[PDB]
Design a protein around this ligand. Structure first.
Ligand SMILES: Nc1ncnc2c1ncn2[C@@H]1O[C@H](COP(=O)(O)OP(=O)(O)O)[C@@H](O)[C@H]1O
Ligand SMILES: Nc1ncnc2c1ncn2[C@@H]1O[C@H](COP(=O)(O)OP(=O)(O)O)[C@@H](O)[C@H]1O
Ligand SMILES: Nc1ncnc2c1ncn2[C@@H]1O[C@H](COP(=O)(O)OP(=O)(O)O)[C@@H](O)[C@H]1O
Ligand code: BEF
Ligand code: BEF
Ligand code: BEF
Ligand SMILES: [Mg+2]
Ligand SMILES: [Mg+2]
Ligand SMILES: [Mg+2]
Lengths: 531, 509, 531
């Protein structure tokens, strides 16, 4: 029943739509899944070309109007916003999940029975994962294992040769900021400075911190070799009266006397620092950075004493620099001690035509690196960053979660089979609820199939192989991990190839996709009221 | 334009009846989800009645009155939302015939319905049994009851826990009734991801605001909290404060003064030896420095609601002017000051290892809102019992009891005054019926049996949801706060009584 | 690639659409399937209410724009145009067939493999039918068996009590026109006169032939009891010169002389007949029918001699009446013999206010009956006819094809199972072609499921029962027919309930649905060019 206006897909039409859409979104992102995926090039309404193969990118970069396509998108973004990886997988999982479920809905089974099954299967899936995972020693310094995690979560979006270029640059970065002995890490301390010119293969890893805002003055230090570094944060430029003020000279040159009187507040606080570069290395063996400004006249003073003065720095660099050098983030200049500056070896300002680029090379206690992404154009400079992030938050996750999972869809093909023969002799489920867990089980085979569907070799066939080369080492006992070899068309050992799915991703992918799908299936009416 | 006569009456009744019709398939343990589309953008995938009807603009006046019923009811008890709508309709509908068919005036049908309500309310308290508001186990299996019929059931136990663990936390008896302001003292916080179970009820607060300066304490063991209104920067005069200077070296003089007052301010704060200073307003860079070496971490910009909840789990009473900053305004009774970085987003905690902060985790920003609302229903029926330790036979049992005791009485009343009374009885029966329907079993069959078994054999006998067979409540139990059964019938009969007062409808301001 | 305008769903989108639509049309007609179907009431753009539950009706009565929905409709109409029954079944079969096939297409299998499978299965299905059928003796006079065929193909569109009213009226009709001793029959010889007034339960069976055009003259025979009947076909009214002619009287009364001269050509041929009703029964123991006209003056002549004269008769009644009476279809009156009139007992003209209704009761050699459909309104009078036809062409089919098939989806649940375990140990198929026959097999379960889906009892459950109560009499040997009991929810013996599917229908339903579906699946691009 109703009131004018306001439309509403009801009965099984609403479910028809929901599944319809999901299945759809699924197919549209299947392409950019697996290392053997597809590179789309999408342009906006302004002509901003941008390349991708990261589900998230393609996803938040498009304008979707399908309600179901949103609830699935939002839940997928909420995944790259936590595990930073697997945004693509989750859309397939909620898609394929609804297809597998719609088959038993279509035959009669009340959706509430397929959802019940899902939860049951879900738990059993998350149990199985904790038994499937691979506790890896908190022992970092195993750069070998981590370099396989870098390449794993990189080939998923990289120019191949460039994978080998970024594989280290990412790992070393994560490590460089990570604090050994369990503890933790905050990726924000890995500046990701990016600059045009020279292809994205030329990008580099800086153990220190690279910046833009250089010393903007002629007679400045082109390169301060070996010196102190001052973390400054107080306004080194002209200021005004916080309360309404004005000058009123009655005398011809009284004007002048009042002229310098304004600037003098500067030098007041400005002297407290200039004598510090005397009070330390006042005879040569040096550079101030400052978050705020530095007007002309002042830049002279610093340029006069050969003090490389930088102004307007990225405010989060206070903390990043306070690790690249050690020196305290000096807010005010009053209580300023000469024993609190920081230290950096070569600190040189590479000028790239109008563009300034000051580096903070040679450090003692880095703890905060900078991945300098190079690249001829903007489209590449874009995607290259979106590759590093999706593969850096990827390594740092191997650390947070001291477990890892064999890739090539090993875990999926496993849980899939398990659940099948599980309830057959488990009955630790319910009545007609077996349907739902059966679906969920069959559902999971998305990733393995789609993984090869992209490669080429027939999904149905190659997946069949894994199902064989698998139980082969079961009828002979012993545990053997099996996955889909996306190069040949046979199975293989993920662990041996160097293929890993981050644990926290799988844990937030399954619990996620089910949350959506299972809540979508219980939907029976799509309103559209309330002008 | 105008519509007098039964014309009016009818359209009102049909209107009201239609309102019900929409959410009737949302009352029951197998209740479906009405994914609604709001104008602003996003969606609502909830099955919680009031949360649906809110997202649907209506036209017919009655349909507007009928729609707000779900609101006033969602304000008394947190639960029983969908039920009031369905009842409120069936009442008007069950009157329809004797209203015109049996030509009974609206005054008479009202005189009876108002009468039949009171009697009906008796039968509610009559079948209601009291409960130990303190017995953790009873409260749980009570809260659990009103968690079924919702997406949050796959963690039912886990939910009642976070429910009780929060109702009781912000509670504060007081007597010279029990006051439980779930609203201002149980700020929820939905965080995307993890697992459901990965959610706890932190006894403190959780702000994502970081620290004012880098080299500042990431976590003070037992911090000394200082909460304040006023900002931390050079203030100005609330009059025409205008300075005239021609005295040369005077520029430096005033420009300095600013630093000076920021100093003073830092002093007064630093004085009571604080480690954590949280202000609602800003923090001058200067003030940061003097509070840095002053030995304390600072948090700028925090909502009043956010702040006043801190002042209940730190005791630190909030104070404006600092030259009056007392030492009683301590920061005692406050555990750590963690600052966990949750997926590229720093947070800050204030747990103690009077007001808690329920932190939910699920599988999407979307899925969480399901939980939050579902939870609210739990956390509300918990509060109800806390302020009325009485419960009613669930499974629509109570609803059927009143159906009989009224039906019986009506039949034994004699006078035109009987028909409207009879209808209230016939009406009530719709809830066990909507239940049995949304179950799948045969309504005419199960009801006749439920009703009969009721007529003699106990009154705590309702219908079982996923089953579809009539079961005794006591048996597998599913009592609900007696308060809900109050409102549901109080306002529903009122609604009906209002709309029945209409014999004419007109259009224009 | 392309030229302006002209759209075209391509790749798997085209197949997506095709299956989409089919599945759709399927669901829309599933409702009016089975005796426990749904009575829809559709009204056109003029307000012509009409009730139905016959797929064909609902189907040709709607305006469809989906290309796939047409190719499926047209092939379904082409079925009611040959077997006269099963228009509904065929739309489900091509629907469910595409769903079952799309599942293996969706996994990878090239459609050409699922079509190959279909043909293979098709043959095997048509083989199995010839082994499944039940040769029933050409022996008619087994009105008992035929009355079960009447009710079988009737409850599929009748008011229940009315089934018992029409069950005989149909059978007796088919028989009445059928020529025993193998031979053949042409249903056209069963007039289906329909008249308003008095509900469609009041309809009757006439062993003779009922007509409208009565004797239009006052002093006519209200009821010619026992008499001859003249099959006339020559114009008994005024005529004109086949070549341009005109009169030209020069004399006052020459006019008059020329007046009668025109009419005299009438009486010329009109006398040759009036003396025939003298030359035979010229003393009372009579009625002429005539396909052409009979002007006023002439009607007098016949009314004068008490000769019931009818004019403008349905031209196909020449042959129908030439059996109801025996008399030759007398074209011209010249060579008109008195030994060639026909004979009927009571031939009375029931006048129903302005409406004339002459009956040709009491016959010796009927061979051509008339099913008089009664009915208060037009909507009912409509549907009642569409029920008789769909159930008359249904009995006459049991005769043509001297075989019959147990209903309740017995044959389907059978072929289904057969094919399953067949190829398992047949391999008389092909390689990956097993998919297609597997689908086709599972597909067939449409009818049984849908049959109960309409009744109520859960499809999945009750069908499971048949699968059990079946092999029960297989593990114990002996043949036991099993079907779905649409009243209880258990299985039952179709043959025992009196439930039969006409053989020729099943033979043209399977070969039909496959023809469409299997040709739809091989479609890869939907053009729309050529303004
Ligand atoms: N070379 C490989 N061979 C088999 N599987 C791999 C290979 N490299 C990574 N994969 C698979 O890539 C899948 C993830 O796809 P990807 O394109 O990275 O999307 P997302 O990571 O956003 O879900 C993982 O399930 C992993 O098993
Ligand atoms: N577990 C159940 N089994 C049978 N009835 C239930 C069950 N759970 C809720 N009920 C009944 O259904 C109604 C509550 O349903 P619900 O969908 O929660 O509506 P509301 O929004 O009013 O809570 C009450 O009458 C309650 O007695
Ligand atoms: N009472 C019955 N019980 C089980 N099957 C029956 C019964 N009566 C007829 N049917 C089924 O009706 C089906 C045909 O449906 P119908 O509505 O007649 O559509 P159509 O004949 O146009 O396909 C046949 O397959 C037959 O098995
Ligand atoms: F393509 Be995913 F985000 F790794
Ligand atoms: F379903 Be109700 F609002 F708890
Ligand atoms: F409904 Be069918 F044409 F018998
Ligand atoms: Mg990835
Ligand atoms: Mg509730
Ligand atoms: Mg039929």
């Amino acid at each position: 029943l109703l009131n004018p206006k306001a439309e509403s897909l009801r009965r099984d039409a609403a479910l028809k739509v929901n599944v319809t859409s999901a299945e759809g979104l699924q197919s549209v992102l299947e392409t950019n899944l697996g290392p053997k995926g597809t590179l789309k090039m999408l342009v906006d309404g302004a002509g901003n070309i941008k390349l991708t193969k990261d589900g998230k990118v393609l996803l938040t970069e498009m304008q979707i109007q399908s309600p179901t396509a949103v609830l699935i998108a939002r839940a997928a973004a909420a995944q790259d916003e936590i595990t930073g990886d697997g945004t693509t997988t989750v859309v397939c999982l909620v898609g394929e999940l609804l297809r597998q479920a719609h088959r038993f809905i279509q035959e009669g089974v009340h959706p509430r029975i397929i959802t019940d099954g899902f939860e049951i299967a879900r738990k059993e899936s998350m149990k199985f994962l904790d038994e499937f995972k691979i506790s890896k020693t908190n022992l970092s310094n195993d750069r070998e294992f981590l370099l396989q995690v870098a390449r794993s979560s990189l080939l998923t979006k990289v120019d191949a040769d460039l994978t080998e270029v970024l594989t280290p640059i990412v790992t070393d970065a994560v490590l460089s900021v990570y604090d050994a002995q369990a503890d933790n890490l905050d990726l924000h301390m890995v500046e990701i400075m990016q600059m045009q010119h020279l292809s994205p293969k030329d990008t580099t890893f800086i153990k220190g911190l690279v910046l833009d805002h250089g010393g903007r003055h002629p007679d400045m230090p082109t390169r301060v070799k070996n010196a102190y570094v001052l973390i400054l944060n107080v306004s080194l430029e002209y200021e005004k009266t916080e309360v309404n003020s004005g000058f009123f000279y009655s005398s011809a040159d009284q004007r002048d006397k009042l002229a310098a009187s304004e600037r003098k507040f500067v030098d007041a606080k400005l002297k407290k620092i200039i004598d510090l570069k005397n009070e330390v290395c006042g005879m040569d063996p040096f550079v101030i950075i400052n978050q705020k400004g530095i007007d002309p006249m002042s830049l002279d003073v610093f340029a006069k004493h050969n003090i490389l003065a930088l102004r307007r720095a990225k405010r989060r660099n206070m903390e990043r620099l306070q690790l690249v050098t050690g020196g305290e983030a000096q807010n005010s200049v009053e209580d300023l001690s000469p024993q609190i500056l920081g230290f950096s070896g070569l600190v040189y300002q590479e000028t790239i035509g109008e563009e300034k680029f000051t580096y903070v090379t040679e450090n003692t206690d880095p703890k905060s690196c900078t991945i300098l992404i190079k690249g001829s154009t903007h489209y590449a400079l874009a995607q290259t960053k979106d590759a590093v992030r999706d593969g850096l938050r990827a390594v740092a996750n191997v650390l947070k979660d001291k477990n890892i999972i064999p890739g090539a869809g090993a875990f999926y093909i496993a849980l899939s089979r398990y659940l099948r023969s599980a309830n057959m002799n488990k009955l630790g489920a319910k009545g007609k609820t077996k349907t739902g867990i059966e679906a969920f089980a069959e559902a999971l085979l998305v990733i393995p199939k789609t993984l090869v569907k992209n490669s080429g070799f027939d999904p149905l066939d190659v997946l069949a192989m894994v199902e064989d080369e698998l139980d082969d080492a079961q009828d002979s006992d012993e545990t053997r991990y099996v996955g889909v070899d996306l190069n040949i068309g046979d199975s293989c050992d993920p662990t041996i190839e160097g293929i890993w799915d981050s644990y926290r991703v799988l844990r937030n992918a399954i619990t996620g996709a089910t949350g959506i799908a299972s809540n979508l299936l219980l939907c029976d009416e799509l309103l559209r009221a309330g002008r | 334009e105008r519509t007098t006569g039964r014309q009016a009456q009818i359209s009102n009744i049909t209107a009201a009846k239609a309102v019900a019709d929409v959410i009737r398939t949302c009352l029951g343990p197998k209740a479906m989800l009405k994914m609604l589309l709001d104008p602003m953008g996003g969606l609502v995938l909830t099955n919680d009645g009031h949360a649906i009807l809110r997202e649907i603009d209506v036209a017919h006046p009655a349909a507007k009155s009928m729609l707000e019923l779900s609101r006033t009811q969602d304000e008394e008890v947190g639960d029983g939302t969908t039920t009031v709508i369905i009842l409120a309709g069936e009442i008007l509908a069950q009157c329809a015939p004797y209203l015109i068919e049996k030509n009974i005036h609206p005054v008479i049908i009202i005189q009876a319905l108002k009468k039949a309500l009171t009697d009906a309310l008796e039968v509610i308290k009559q079948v209601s049994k009291p409960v130990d508001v303190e017995n953790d186990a009873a409260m749980k299996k009570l809260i659990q009851a009103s968690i079924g019929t919702k997406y949050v059931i796959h963690w039912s136990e886990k939910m009642c826990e976070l429910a009780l663990d929060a109702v009781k936390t912000v509670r504060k008896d007081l007597g010279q009734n029990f006051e439980i302001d779930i609203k201002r003292y149980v700020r929820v916080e939905k965080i995307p991801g993890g697992d459901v179970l990965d959610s706890r009820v932190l006894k403190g607060v959780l702000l994502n605001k970081d620290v004012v300066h880098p080299k500042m304490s990431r976590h003070i063991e037992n911090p000394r909290v200082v909460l304040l209104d006023c900002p931390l920067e050079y203030k100005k005069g609330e009059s025409q404060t205008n300075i005239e200077i021609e005295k040369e070296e005077d520029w430096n003089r005033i420009l300095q003064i600013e630093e000076e007052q920021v100093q003073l301010m830092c002093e007064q704060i630093l004085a009571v030896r604080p480690t954590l200073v949280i202000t609602e307003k800003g923090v001058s860079d200067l003030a940061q420095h003097y509070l840095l070496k002053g030995g304390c971490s600072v948090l700028r910009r925090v909502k009043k609601s956010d702040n006043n909840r801190i002042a209940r789990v730190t005791g630190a009473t909030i104070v404006n002017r600092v030259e009056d900053l007392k030492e009683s305004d301590v920061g005692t009774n406050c555990g750590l000051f963690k600052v966990e970085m949750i997926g590229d987003e720093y947070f800050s905690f204030l747990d103690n290892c009077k007001a808690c902060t329920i932190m939910l985790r699920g599988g999407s920003k979307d899925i969480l809102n399901e939980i939050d609302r579902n939870l609210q229903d739990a956390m509300a029926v918990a509060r109800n019992v806390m302020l009325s330790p009485s419960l009613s036979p669930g499974g629509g049992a109570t609803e059927m009891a009143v159906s009989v005791k009224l039906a019986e009485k009506a039949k034994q009343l004699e006078g035109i005054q009987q028909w409207p009374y009879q209808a209230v009885a016939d009406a009530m029966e719709c809830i066990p019926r909507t239940l049995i329907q949304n179950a799948g079993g045969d309504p005419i069959r199960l009801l006749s049996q439920l009703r009969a078994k009721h007529a003699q054999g106990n009154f705590t006998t309702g219908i079982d949801g996923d089953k579809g067979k009539i079961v005794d409540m006591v048996s597998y139990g599913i009592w609900e706060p007696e308060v809900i059964k109050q409102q549901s019938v109080k306002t529903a009969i009122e609604s009906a009584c209002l709309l029945l007062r209409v014999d004419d409808i007109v259009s224009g301001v």
